Amino acid sequence: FNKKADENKVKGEAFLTENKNKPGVVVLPSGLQYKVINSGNGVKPGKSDTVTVEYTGRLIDGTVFDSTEKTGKPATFQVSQVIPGWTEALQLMPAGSTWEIYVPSGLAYGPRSVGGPIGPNETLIFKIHLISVKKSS
Ligand SMILES: CO[C@H]1C[C@@H]2CC[C@@H](C)[C@@](O)(O2)C(=O)C(=O)N2CCCC[C@H]2C(=O)O[C@H]([C@H](C)C[C@@H]2CC[C@@H](O)[C@H](OC)C2)CC(=O)[C@H](C)/C=C(\C)[C@@H](O)[C@@H](OC)C(=O)[C@H](C)C[C@H](C)/C=C/C=C/C=C/1C
């Protein structure tokens, strides 16, 4: 079944390679890429602050394994408990601004199939809309 690993691997290596190149996308040294769907330039949380957002998660191949923005109902996460990719992105995503981040498998759910449809060597992407921001102290 590792055969699939190669697909996730190639599509994924191509996904990041392609995504960083895709317009609106900004790539970082960590390999994390974010695209600003809507600029808000508002507030936003630190690694320890809490955030409120809505989002849709899918595979490089379009296999949607999770969603929330579809519902449009925000979810609360602590930047410290969120996926690594998300960890930095929220801190860079201003409130009111809607971004899309493409998280390298290393910064996402792992290089292994760590999920349902999420197969071996899967790169995951999510759409992140910032509705409200908290604060640790
Ligand atoms: C894992 O299983 C997932 C289930 C699915 C997997 C697929 C993804 C699409 C999703 O649907 O969650 C999903 O919505 C999701 O993961 N999201 C939503 C979008 C941003 C945050 C991200 C995510 O889960 O970040 C976080 C990320 C998944 C956790 C790990 C971060 C490090 C990274 O290396 C790991 O890779 C695997 C994943 C989890 C969160 O959503 C937010 C921030 C964290 C919580 C609310 C905390 O409750 C959680 O923090 C971990 C905790 O473990 C606390 C302490 C204790 C409680 C009882 C346990 C919660 C467990 C949550 C587990 C979750 C949701």
CSV table of C-alpha atoms and ligand atoms in Angstrom, one decimal:
chain,number,residue,atom,x,y,z
A,1,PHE,CA,0.0,0.0,0.0
A,2,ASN,CA,3.1,2.2,0.2
A,3,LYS,CA,2.5,2.7,-3.5
A,4,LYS,CA,0.1,5.4,-2.4
A,5,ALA,CA,2.9,6.9,-0.2
A,6,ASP,CA,4.6,7.7,-3.5
A,7,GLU,CA,1.6,9.6,-4.8
A,8,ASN,CA,1.1,11.7,-1.7
A,9,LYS,CA,4.8,12.1,-1.8
A,10,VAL,CA,5.0,13.3,-5.4
A,11,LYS,CA,1.8,15.2,-5.5
A,12,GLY,CA,2.8,16.6,-2.1
A,13,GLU,CA,6.3,17.6,-3.2
A,14,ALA,CA,4.6,19.1,-6.2
A,15,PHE,CA,1.9,20.6,-4.1
A,16,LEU,CA,4.3,22.6,-2.0
A,17,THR,CA,6.4,23.3,-5.0
A,18,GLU,CA,3.4,24.3,-7.0
A,19,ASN,CA,1.6,26.1,-4.1
A,20,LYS,CA,4.5,28.3,-3.2
A,21,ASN,CA,4.5,29.3,-6.8
A,22,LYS,CA,0.7,29.8,-7.0
A,23,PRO,CA,-0.3,33.5,-6.7
A,24,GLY,CA,-1.2,35.0,-3.3
A,25,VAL,CA,0.8,32.3,-1.6
A,26,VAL,CA,3.8,33.2,0.5
A,27,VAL,CA,6.4,30.5,1.4
A,28,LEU,CA,8.4,30.4,4.5
A,29,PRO,CA,11.8,28.7,5.4
A,30,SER,CA,9.8,26.2,7.5
A,31,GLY,CA,8.2,25.2,4.3
A,32,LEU,CA,4.9,26.5,5.5
A,33,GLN,CA,3.0,28.5,2.9
A,34,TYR,CA,0.1,30.9,3.5
A,35,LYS,CA,-2.2,32.8,1.1
A,36,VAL,CA,-4.3,35.8,2.0
A,37,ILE,CA,-7.9,35.3,0.8
A,38,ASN,CA,-8.9,38.4,2.5
A,39,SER,CA,-6.7,41.1,4.2
A,40,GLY,CA,-7.9,42.3,7.6
A,41,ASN,CA,-4.7,43.5,9.2
A,42,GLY,CA,-6.4,43.1,12.6
A,43,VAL,CA,-5.2,41.5,15.8
A,44,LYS,CA,-4.1,37.9,16.2
A,45,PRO,CA,-2.8,35.5,18.9
A,46,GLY,CA,0.7,34.4,20.1
A,47,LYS,CA,1.9,30.9,20.4
A,48,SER,CA,0.2,30.8,23.8
A,49,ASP,CA,-2.9,32.9,23.1
A,50,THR,CA,-6.2,31.5,21.9
A,51,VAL,CA,-7.9,32.0,18.6
A,52,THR,CA,-11.3,31.6,17.1
A,53,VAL,CA,-11.6,30.4,13.4
A,54,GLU,CA,-13.6,28.5,10.7
A,55,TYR,CA,-11.8,26.2,8.2
A,56,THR,CA,-11.8,23.5,5.5
A,57,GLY,CA,-9.1,20.8,5.4
A,58,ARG,CA,-8.2,18.7,2.3
A,59,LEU,CA,-5.6,16.6,0.7
A,60,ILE,CA,-3.2,17.7,-2.1
A,61,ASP,CA,-5.3,15.5,-4.3
A,62,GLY,CA,-8.5,17.2,-3.3
A,63,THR,CA,-9.6,14.4,-0.9
A,64,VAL,CA,-11.5,16.4,1.8
A,65,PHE,CA,-11.0,14.8,5.1
A,66,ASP,CA,-12.3,17.6,7.3
A,67,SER,CA,-14.3,20.9,7.2
A,68,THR,CA,-15.7,23.7,9.3
A,69,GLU,CA,-15.8,26.8,7.2
A,70,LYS,CA,-18.4,25.1,5.1
A,71,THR,CA,-20.6,25.4,8.2
A,72,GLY,CA,-19.0,28.8,8.8
A,73,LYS,CA,-19.0,28.1,12.5
A,74,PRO,CA,-15.7,29.2,14.3
A,75,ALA,CA,-13.6,26.8,16.4
A,76,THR,CA,-11.4,27.8,19.3
A,77,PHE,CA,-7.8,26.7,19.5
A,78,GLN,CA,-4.8,27.5,21.5
A,79,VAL,CA,-2.0,28.4,19.1
A,80,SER,CA,0.2,26.1,21.3
A,81,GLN,CA,-2.1,23.1,20.8
A,82,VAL,CA,-2.7,23.7,17.1
A,83,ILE,CA,-0.8,22.0,14.2
A,84,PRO,CA,2.7,23.5,13.7
A,85,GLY,CA,1.8,25.1,10.4
A,86,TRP,CA,-1.2,26.6,12.1
A,87,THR,CA,0.9,27.6,15.1
A,88,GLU,CA,2.9,30.1,13.1
A,89,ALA,CA,0.2,31.1,10.6
A,90,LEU,CA,-2.4,32.3,13.3
A,91,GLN,CA,0.3,34.4,14.8
A,92,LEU,CA,0.8,36.0,11.3
A,93,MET,CA,-2.9,36.0,10.3
A,94,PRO,CA,-4.5,39.4,11.3
A,95,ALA,CA,-8.0,39.3,12.6
A,96,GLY,CA,-10.7,39.8,10.0
A,97,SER,CA,-8.3,38.5,7.4
A,98,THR,CA,-9.1,35.1,5.8
A,99,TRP,CA,-6.0,33.1,4.8
A,100,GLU,CA,-5.2,29.7,3.4
A,101,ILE,CA,-2.2,27.7,4.6
A,102,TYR,CA,-0.6,24.7,3.0
A,103,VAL,CA,1.0,22.8,5.8
A,104,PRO,CA,3.9,20.4,4.9
A,105,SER,CA,3.3,16.9,6.2
A,106,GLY,CA,6.1,17.5,8.7
A,107,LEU,CA,4.3,20.6,10.0
A,108,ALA,CA,0.8,19.0,9.7
A,109,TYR,CA,-0.3,15.5,10.7
A,110,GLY,CA,3.1,13.8,10.0
A,111,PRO,CA,4.9,12.1,7.1
A,112,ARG,CA,2.9,8.9,7.9
A,113,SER,CA,-0.8,8.2,7.4
A,114,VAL,CA,-1.9,9.8,10.7
A,115,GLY,CA,-5.6,9.9,10.0
A,116,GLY,CA,-8.6,8.4,8.0
A,117,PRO,CA,-8.3,9.2,4.3
A,118,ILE,CA,-5.0,10.8,5.1
A,119,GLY,CA,-2.6,8.4,3.6
A,120,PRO,CA,1.2,7.9,3.9
A,121,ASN,CA,3.3,11.0,3.3
A,122,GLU,CA,0.3,13.3,3.2
A,123,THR,CA,0.6,17.1,3.0
A,124,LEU,CA,-2.5,18.8,4.4
A,125,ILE,CA,-3.9,22.2,3.7
A,126,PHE,CA,-6.5,24.3,5.5
A,127,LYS,CA,-8.5,27.5,5.0
A,128,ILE,CA,-8.3,29.7,8.0
A,129,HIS,CA,-10.8,32.5,8.7
A,130,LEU,CA,-10.1,34.6,11.8
A,131,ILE,CA,-13.4,35.7,13.5
A,132,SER,CA,-12.1,36.5,17.0
A,133,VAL,CA,-8.9,36.3,19.1
A,134,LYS,CA,-8.3,35.7,22.8
A,135,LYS,CA,-5.2,36.1,25.0
A,136,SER,CA,-3.3,34.1,27.6
A,137,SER,CA,-2.2,36.9,29.8
B,1,LIG,C1,-5.7,14.7,16.4
B,1,LIG,O1,-7.1,14.5,16.3
B,1,LIG,C2,-7.8,15.6,15.8
B,1,LIG,C3,-9.1,15.3,15.1
B,1,LIG,C4,-9.1,15.9,13.7
B,1,LIG,C5,-8.0,15.4,12.9
B,1,LIG,C6,-8.2,16.0,11.5
B,1,LIG,C7,-8.2,17.5,11.6
B,1,LIG,C8,-8.5,18.1,10.2
B,1,LIG,C9,-9.3,17.9,12.6
B,1,LIG,O2,-10.6,17.6,12.1
B,1,LIG,O3,-9.1,17.3,13.9
B,1,LIG,C10,-9.2,19.3,12.8
B,1,LIG,O4,-10.2,20.0,12.8
B,1,LIG,C11,-8.0,19.8,13.2
B,1,LIG,O5,-7.1,19.0,13.5
B,1,LIG,N1,-7.7,21.1,13.4
B,1,LIG,C12,-8.7,22.2,13.0
B,1,LIG,C13,-8.0,23.3,12.3
B,1,LIG,C14,-6.9,23.9,13.2
B,1,LIG,C15,-6.4,23.0,14.3
B,1,LIG,C16,-6.4,21.6,13.8
B,1,LIG,C17,-6.0,20.8,14.9
B,1,LIG,O6,-6.6,19.9,15.3
B,1,LIG,O7,-4.9,21.4,15.6
B,1,LIG,C18,-4.5,20.6,16.7
B,1,LIG,C19,-3.6,19.4,16.3
B,1,LIG,C20,-4.5,18.4,15.5
B,1,LIG,C21,-3.1,18.7,17.5
B,1,LIG,C22,-1.6,18.2,17.2
B,1,LIG,C23,-0.7,19.4,17.2
B,1,LIG,C24,0.7,19.0,16.9
B,1,LIG,C25,0.8,18.2,15.6
B,1,LIG,O8,2.1,17.8,15.3
B,1,LIG,C26,-0.2,17.0,15.6
B,1,LIG,O9,-0.1,16.3,14.4
B,1,LIG,C27,-0.9,15.1,14.4
B,1,LIG,C28,-1.6,17.5,15.9
B,1,LIG,C29,-5.6,20.1,17.6
B,1,LIG,C30,-6.6,21.1,17.7
B,1,LIG,O10,-7.5,21.2,16.9
B,1,LIG,C31,-6.6,22.0,18.8
B,1,LIG,C32,-5.6,23.1,18.6
B,1,LIG,C33,-6.2,21.4,20.0
B,1,LIG,C34,-7.2,21.0,20.9
B,1,LIG,C35,-8.5,21.6,20.9
B,1,LIG,C36,-6.8,20.3,22.1
B,1,LIG,O11,-8.0,19.7,22.7
B,1,LIG,C37,-5.8,19.2,21.7
B,1,LIG,O12,-4.6,19.8,21.3
B,1,LIG,C38,-3.8,18.9,20.6
B,1,LIG,C39,-5.6,18.4,22.8
B,1,LIG,O13,-5.1,17.3,22.6
B,1,LIG,C40,-5.9,18.8,24.1
B,1,LIG,C41,-4.5,19.1,24.8
B,1,LIG,C42,-6.6,17.7,24.9
B,1,LIG,C43,-7.9,17.3,24.2
B,1,LIG,C44,-8.8,16.5,25.1
B,1,LIG,C45,-7.6,16.5,23.0
B,1,LIG,C46,-8.0,17.0,21.7
B,1,LIG,C47,-7.7,16.3,20.6
B,1,LIG,C48,-8.0,16.8,19.3
B,1,LIG,C49,-7.7,16.0,18.2
B,1,LIG,C50,-8.0,16.5,16.9
B,1,LIG,C51,-8.6,17.7,16.7
